[PDB]
Design a protein around this ligand. Structure first.
Ligand SMILES: [Zn+2]
Ligand SMILES: [Zn+2]
Ligand SMILES: [Zn+2]
Ligand SMILES: [Zn+2]
Length: 72
């Protein structure tokens, strides 16, 4: 599954993931791409705040879905 993560500046990160990847796994991948620490990352998909220990398929994230890094 290819997904897109937009940073707070709107830069697109493209990631290759599996349905069972956790959000914590996705935060690690974002750290590798952009140097953003996982504990500073907050992700949203379709208005939903994404929890570290749940999976992409738990949130119905699919091929070409876009997630956003946001502020609290
Ligand atoms: Zn894939
Ligand atoms: Zn696998
Ligand atoms: Zn994985
Ligand atoms: Zn795996």
């Amino acid at each position: 599954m290819q997904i897109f993560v937009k940073t707070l500046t709107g830069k697109t990160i493209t990631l290759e993931v599996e349905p069972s990847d956790t959000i914590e796994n996705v935060k690690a991948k974002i750290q590798d791409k952009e140097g953003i620490p996982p504990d500073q990352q907050r992700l949203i998909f379709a208005g939903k705040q994404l929890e570290d220990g749940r999976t992409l398929s738990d949130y119905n994230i699919q091929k070409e879905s876009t997630l956003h890094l946001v502020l609290r």
